[PDB]
RNA sequence: CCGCCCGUCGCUAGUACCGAUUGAAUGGCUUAGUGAGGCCUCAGGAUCUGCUUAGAGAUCUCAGAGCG
RNA sequence: AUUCAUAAUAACUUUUCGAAUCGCAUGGCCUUGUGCUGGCGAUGGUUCAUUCAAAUUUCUGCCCUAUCAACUUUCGAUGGUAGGAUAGUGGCCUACCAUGGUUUCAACGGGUAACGGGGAAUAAGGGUUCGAUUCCGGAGAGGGAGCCUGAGAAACGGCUACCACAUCCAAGGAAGGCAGCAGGCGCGCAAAUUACCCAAUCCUAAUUCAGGGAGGUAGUGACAAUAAAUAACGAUACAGGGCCCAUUCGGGUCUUGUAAUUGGAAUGAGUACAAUGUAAAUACCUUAACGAGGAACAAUUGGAGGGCAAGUCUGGUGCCAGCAGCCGCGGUAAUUCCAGCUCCAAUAGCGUAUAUUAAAGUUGUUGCAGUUAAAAAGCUCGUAGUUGAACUUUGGGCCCGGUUGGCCGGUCGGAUUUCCAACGGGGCCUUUCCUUCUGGCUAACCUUGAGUCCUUGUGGCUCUUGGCGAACC
RNA sequence: UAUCUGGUUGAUCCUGCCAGUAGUCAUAUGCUUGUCUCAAAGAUUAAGCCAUGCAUGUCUAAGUAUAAGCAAUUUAUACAGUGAAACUGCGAAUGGCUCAUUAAAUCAGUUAUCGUUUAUUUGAUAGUUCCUUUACUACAUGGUAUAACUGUGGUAAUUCUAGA
């Protein structure tokens, strides 16, 4: 209707923020960012409705407009901006440090991390091109791209990205053998390393993955992203570990033996 | 305009309102427990009724399905804490069977006189709806309630009002203040 | 009053607004509600932070009696609890104090007829005065 | 069987249809003719404003003319 | 998959960009001058990606109607050529050329008390009806048409004209739009206050400090729902079971009901100190001080022939007035009318209309009927449509091997562990084709070094000088 | 919660309706009306008309402020405390409202743009323009205006506006 829609009320917003249906109309649209609308967070969500820390917008602002708090080790003041998958949210609040990575249900956890953890973060590669002047170059799910890359770096692959200097670190390639999250719909917040991959012409290759405990199953290859070597994750993993237990296993562990 | 607060009723009326096998039975159950309407009653048989549907809709499925076992022993061990059914039935199969008495016997309407000191059900019921009794620190005053098995033992008088302890009340301030004491000018 | 007892639950510390948030649980046999002034009296004496520096507000009864839920805040220094704590409950307090000015369909009408002239104004006065 | 019942005829009330009206009103579509208004262009140049061979006495209008 | 990203030549530009911008702390340097360098930002800045989107677009599906069988082709119909136009493809539009495209597997027209979905009502299963309405999408802000400005509009709380309504007026002109909030009039069978407030949940701005009937907060609210007061307990007089220790002739707990006979006890509804609640109040939740024993603080709404539960009780009326969804009641004894007594239903809620779902296997695919009750077309041909014989590799084994339950329970009701029957799998051989061929493999090991730390078990951990290319592309 | 029951006959069994029956986020309407929670509420005739008021404005350390403003600068004859007004830049195309038209159109699921625009965020990004880079005009950084403003008015009148 006539240009961009700027409001958003409760209910279209996605099920994975945890909003409650009352105490309020509308939710928080996120801001144009590097990540898409759907998947990924809002600050103001990460703060008030996660951690706990604000209770009002009002407390959110003024926690976010005396810096401190920072994505990327940036100042990033807006109140909706985009936090989405991997990113490193620096605080000086007694020197926190938060990554986003999904869940078992996929959620945005508060799962900490460590203070090394924090140099770095990780980027799956969507193109690879020359720009001008005929200089090759990478682009990350978050918009992040980077000058001069490897001839290695090929589509679909995954980065590690420094922060403090735009530059690759390191790369991993894609196929079998490595440690493989994937995130996106019905498995989002699994890891199974990739059995074997599907080619399929004319777009959407199925990628078949196997955790383990050999529960195996298939995704779409854009919402399967890779992340280290066979038993070596180069990021921290959350309390779960991408396995998804069956409602039976939950009916025992999380409804029985936690009991006091 | 936000999101609906939604909503169903939970009494559920007959098909035929004029019968004499029903309205004869059914009023008897209305005497002995102290039940104010058929209302009541409506809404105990229809959550007897959902949870008749749901047991026949388990069964139909195979056994050694994840479906029919978590969704089985949840709904078996709810009729358990709630203390319908015993430990002895724990089958599935036997909460098709069940009946609305065992439903009316679990309220803390009757509870109160099942364990005694109230002497009838209705002044059982008085005692409820007149803000006495309590589970246990939290005082309740509702005659529909359903106990859940554990809270039995700690049903007594509340801390506030009488027996338990605490003030007087109206009256017995009034005989005691404006008419015994009241004699001597 | 009886047993009183202050039990702040859940307690979360918060660096980042320097402050402490926290579940004030009650207990008050034999007396009418719990009186937050009272309890900003008495919160001193696990804390101590004066009185205005801590803070509190947000409270509700149990059923029937005897008991009070509520959620509040400390803060540490006084400046940082005028600066972070709402504009309302300050007045609450007895700190601020609110300029109680006119209506507000008043306040729209005054903008509306102060969208009505262009400039200062003060021009068309003056073109009044020489005309009469 | 004196049983039932079928229709021509008189009688109260309605009900559609037909319709005197070359009814009347309102709508969409359209023959022919007319067509404001902005928008786009062919022109037009009230006016404002730079430059210059050049006008006046040692970023001065005092003549104009050209170049815009 | 490309005339792609991209580069390099020959060009043109009527000229895109390359900061003449602004603030905080003020230093670090040098043969020492208002000298050379200098951090932390903010806002601009062309292209590229990213985000927010936007625009077009593939397939597939929609309510009734043949008393709507031919429509589209004129000044666009379907297709092609070339242009113009657009951010763009494209009959989108021009000039030329061609004669196509749709259709009874139902086009084209007409109707819709038709915005489309997500859903709602009903429910055995299948269905039928509704969806203006809290979310997504569309369209329009009286009717049409055109346009400025911006990234974005064909915007309407922007403009422009014409049409229809309609206002101020000195008649000279000037200003209009609530299908935003709250209201007023109309039409109505039908619907609320010209209230408070940005404290929430968001949004906008040069932006933590402003603004927002977006929204939230009260009121009005029997549209709908949830819980649920409308009175409990004794004593005395009645027809009783008769119970406790069973010393059967001691006195009263439980009482089944009927009794204005009576004695205390517990409360709310309601009034309100205070506090809480809240942007600020009203409520709620609390709770001092008060507030039950009868015209008190009283509950009704429909019925009482049958369907349908409850009356052949009492008086009036006398086919009159009336009741009656249906059948039927009323002509002077009315179990149906009018009242009153008593009773029944539901019970702060019932009755009455109109629509609709179920029952309606009275639309029927599941699941109707068609001799005589309505219904088989006079009979045959015949195009579409629907349906249409059988027959084109079963068996046998060999192993590998997961799932069921019990002795093996040597672990203390679970199962270490395999014989055992059944149940589904995977290989191989049986004339049986499970696509082939080539560079990394010479891989599923005829290549074998010492083959052993394994009850005289072809059931199972290791390894050298090296062999048959699909286990992957 | 897979259910029936009265009505045509003198009595019967049928076809077949009629009426009963329960529900309704489908409405109205009658009577009655104490409490708590929760709540849709000018859609249906009429996208018929509307008095009047209000609903979109906007500031930081950081664009322009000799207001002939306020309170004073006590570092300021460059302003350099605050700050109405106006200029500029953004916003006003989101929202909220209603459903009149609209039947392969909207619409849902589902692709595609290798037929494209994309403000703003987000990340990268033009040392080669005095094209005589041999004097060429300043790059210690230059010109054209113009609102608010002071004052003179026009009209019956509107967030009408004229000169200087």
Redesign the interface.
Known sequence: ARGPKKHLKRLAAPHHWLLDKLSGCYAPRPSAGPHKLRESLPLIVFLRNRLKYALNGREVKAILMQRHVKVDGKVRTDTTYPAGFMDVITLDATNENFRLVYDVKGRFAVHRITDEEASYKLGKVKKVQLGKKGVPYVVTHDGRTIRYPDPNIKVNDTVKIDLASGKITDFIKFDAGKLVYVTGGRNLGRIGTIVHKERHDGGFDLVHIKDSLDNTFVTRLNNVFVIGEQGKPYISLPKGKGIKLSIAEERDRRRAQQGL | PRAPRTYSKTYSTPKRPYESSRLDAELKLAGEFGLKNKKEIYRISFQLSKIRRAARDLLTRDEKDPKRLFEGNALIRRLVRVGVLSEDKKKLDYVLALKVEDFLERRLQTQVYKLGLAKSVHHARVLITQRHIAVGKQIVNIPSFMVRLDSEKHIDFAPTSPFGGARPGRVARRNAARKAEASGE | SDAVTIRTRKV?S????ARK?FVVDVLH?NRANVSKDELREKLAEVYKAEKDAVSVFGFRT??????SVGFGLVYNSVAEAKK?E?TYRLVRYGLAEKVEKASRQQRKQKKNRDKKIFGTGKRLAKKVARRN
């Open positions: 979360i918060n660096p980042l607004l948030q046999p149990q059923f029937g009696g005897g008991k972070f709402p």
